[PDB]
Design a protein around this nucleic acid. Structure first.
Length: 437
RNA sequence: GGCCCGGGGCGGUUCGAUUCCGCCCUGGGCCACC
């Protein structure tokens, strides 16, 4: 188990099995013939065209090249039309840029429309840079695609491989830039231990300089941060993972971490031991794309957590879970119950203009003097975290995300105790409380 | 849809709000869906 050896066994986990390779080639060729029959301009790109797709994550990306002059509406209608007559079956679901996902002879295919530009300067559709990335990458990644897969399986096996809002990790494209820059998976991990939240990797200039935030500048467009959606906490989890791996080189870093099957009974006893307040906000899942849902779930979660902290329920952490039916906003606090009364800080005895206005308010306890200023005893309209959330959510639904918020406006409940462990959140709850074993 | 920066109208809470909780407009970026 000496790094170097562990990487030899690892390839067996990230390199695609010759059967899968054929399957993909067999499909790519078919895809070609179907599109030629239509005689449309296209180009294969991504993991497949560069043969750097992670074993088991096969998916072809065909790109329909359209004239800069065409409407975005024209791309949507023409694009989807073509992709539909080209796939065995399809599925159309996207957040902003229209494309068709489907299957041809078994492999997953992404038929995406985009404008054929000259220079990836001022892109007109969200994806216009991909083809230029392919040209920039095909000549330089050649011979190091296995190195890309180690990295991809590494990030994947540790939950930070995707770059979409659900993951907020490293994009496949980022992975390939890191390899072209550092030269290998090992070199990347060796240096990633020294990355900070200000590290700027400039592939084009071949340099690493300190900056504002973590910025991996695109060879294709200097104003573009390739690691733009990589959360701070994930950059941290990676760096830390790189440090551990170099010290305890084990091929467990490439294996999909434990499935975790904890007993809903073991959990309840832990909560009892923690003596904290744990509960979720349950509402119906909005029929919308993951890329729209999660940012909203992060917002609702945060907006409620922030309410709980300023209201003194001493929040610990929050997490969210979205099943196919509902969504869950999870919380844990330190104050299961607070008092009715609390102090409110008034003016200093000095200026009376305000001292008087302060004491004029009909209070139930009569204000007192402490250290130079007046204080008042006030009563809260709720004494538990649940009560607070119930009030808050019912009253601030609109602010908890456009879609999430509207749903909560039409329904939401607060689950606690046993009734909460029956729900599909026992996995996120453990993760939240740092329960080990 | 989310984030960031800026204009203008407001409501609530507070002795005291541009400054705390929010609501309408509105201008410009950026990100995720490839």
């Amino acid at each position: 188990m000496k790094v170097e050896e562990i990487l030899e066994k690892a390839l067996e986990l990230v390199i695609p099995d010759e059967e899968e390779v054929r399957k993909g080639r067999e499909a790519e060729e078919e895809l070609r013939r179907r599109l030629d029959e239509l005689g449309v301009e296209y180009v294969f790109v991504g993991s497949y065209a560069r043969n750097t797709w992670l074993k088991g994550s096969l998916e072809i990306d065909v790109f329909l090249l359209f004239p800069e002059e065409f409407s975005k509406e024209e791309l949507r209608e023409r694009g989807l039309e073509i992709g539909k007559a080209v796939l065995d079956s399809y599925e159309i679901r996207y957040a902003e840029h229209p494309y068709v996902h489907g299957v041809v002879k078994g492999v997953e295919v992404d038929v995406v429309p985009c404008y054929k530009l000259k220079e990836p300067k001022n892109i007109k559709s969200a994806v216009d840079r991909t083809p230029f990335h392919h040209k920039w990458l095909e000549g330089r990644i050649k011979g190091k695609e296995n190195e890309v897969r180690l990295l991809k399986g590494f990030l994947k096996a540790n939950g930070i491989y995707g770059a979409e809002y659900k993951v907020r990790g490293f994009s496949g494209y980022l992975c390939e830039l890191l390899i072209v820059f550092y030269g290998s998976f090992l070199e990347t991990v060796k240096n990633a231990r020294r990355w900070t939240r200000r590290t700027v990797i400039d592939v084009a200039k071949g340099e690493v300089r300190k900056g504002e935030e973590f910025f991996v500048v695109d060879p294709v467009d200097e104003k573009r941060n390739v690691a733009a959606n990589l959360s701070l906490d994930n950059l941290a989890r990676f760096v830390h993972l790189c440090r551990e791996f170099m010290e305890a080189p084990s091929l467990g870093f490439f294996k999909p971490k434990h499935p975790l099957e904890i007993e809903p009974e073991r959990l309840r006893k832990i909560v009892e031991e923690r003596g904290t307040a744990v509960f979720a906000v349950k509402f119906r899942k909005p029929d919308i794309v993951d890329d729209n849902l999660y940012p909203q779930l992060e917002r609702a979660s945060r907006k409620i957590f922030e309410f709980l902290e300023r209201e003194n329920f001493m929040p610990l952490r929050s997490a969210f879970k979205a099943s196919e039916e509902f969504c869950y906003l999870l919380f844990e606090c330190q104050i299961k119950e607070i008092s009715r009364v609390f102090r409110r800080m008034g003016p200093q005895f000095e200026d009376e203009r305000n001292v008087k206005k302060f004491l004029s308010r009909n209070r139930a306890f009569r204000p007192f003097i402490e250290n130079g200023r007046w204080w008042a005893f006030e009563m809260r309209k709720f004494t538990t975290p649940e009560e607070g959330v119930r009030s808050y959510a019912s009253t601030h639904w609109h602010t908890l995300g456009k879609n999430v918020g509207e749903s909560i406006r039409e329904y939401f409940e607060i689950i606690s105790g046993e009734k909460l462990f029956k729900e599909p959140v026992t996995a996120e709850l453990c993760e939240m409380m740092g329960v080990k074993d």
